[PDB]
Design a binder for this molecule. Structure first.
Ligand SMILES: c1nc(N[C@H]2CC[C@H](N3CCOCC3)CC2)c2c(C3CCOCC3)c[nH]c2n1
Length: 272
């Protein structure tokens, strides 16, 4: 990793312009930078902010995969410079934010496969992400899935400080348990977002939580066909049902009854 001086980063981000690009700010603070013709994502870092900065460098140094975001450098006032992802997050693309076209079913299968390949690398290298969600699955120029945000990542165990996203968390994760099986539950929610194009949580929706549709389908009140994203023209029944089967297995309420990331990876390969 390159050690950037604060002035190199202040300059490339137009004095850290906090106005949206349509300025330099792309979201929350993350700015668009230009270092040596190359575009970069500069994250400028209620006192655990300094604590997150150390954990991210540590995990990034050890974890380098094609389905994980690459950290280019850091600065020390604290900054983290990453490889720029032109197609934003899976969340933004599924919601078609800023008039972007809907992702095809074909593209969606490749993202599911890619994201699972990234989680497989993490679990093979004994890392638990703890915050697997579509906002943390970024997309490059070819729509290759890239797992991001390793601030909460950890190397049978219980914690006093429960962290993650409530709408994506496993029952045991909410109880304080730290296990890679919790990451499998979170990926099941992400697969449901890919299938439906719906957010994991919507306060003006029945059900409010997307994971609750599994029970609606199992209690034969509704079908998966009723929930399939209508913003697609290539979603064949066979592969959508096959992805919902993986999502359903992932969302098993009992950790030991869920498949490992290798089986998830295997089932997604079989789907195509
Ligand atoms: C591009 N965009 C990025 N992240 C952005 C952040 C803004 C977001 N919003 C959501 C709200 O709508 C507008 C976009 C879309 C993803 C990144 C990152 C992140 C930076 C933060 O640490 C984790 C890795 C690395 N490389 C990127 N290349």
């Amino acid at each position: 990793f390159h050690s950037f001086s604060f002035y190199e980063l202040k300059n490339v981000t137009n004095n850290f312009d906090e106005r949206p690009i349509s300025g330099n700010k792309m979201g929350e603070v993350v700015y668009k930078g230009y270092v040596n013709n190359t575009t970069v994502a500069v994250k400028k870092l209620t006192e655990e902010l300094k604590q997150q900065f150390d954990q991210e460098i540590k995990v990034m140094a050890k974890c380098q995969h094609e389905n994980l975001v690459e950290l280019l450098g850091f600065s020390s006032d604290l900054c983290l410079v990453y490889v720029y992802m032109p197609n934003g997050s899976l969340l933004d693309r599924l919601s078609c934010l800023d008039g972007t076209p809907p992702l095809s079913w074909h593209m969606r299968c490749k993202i599911a496969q890619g994201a699972a390949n990234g989680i497989n690398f993490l679990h093979e290298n004994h890392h638990i992400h703890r915050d697997i969600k579509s906002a943390n699955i970024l997309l490059d120029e070819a729509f290759t899935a890239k797992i991001s945000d390793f601030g909460l990542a950890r190397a049978t165990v219980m914690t006093s400080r429960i962290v993650g996203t409530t709408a994506y968390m496993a029952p045991e994760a909410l109880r304080g348990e730290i296990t890679p099986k919790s990451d499998i539950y979170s990926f099941g929610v992400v697969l449901l977002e890919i299938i439906t194009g719906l957010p994991a949580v919507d306060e003006h929706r029945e059900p409010q939580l997307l994971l609750d549709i599994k029970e609606e389908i199992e209690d034969e009140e509704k079908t998966i066909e009723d929930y399939i994203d209508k913003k697609m023209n290539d979603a064949d029944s066979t592969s959508v049902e096959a992805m919902y089967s993986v999502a359903s297995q992932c969302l098993h309420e009992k950790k030991n009854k869920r498949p490992d990331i290798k089986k998830v990876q295997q089932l997604l390969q079989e789907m195509t």
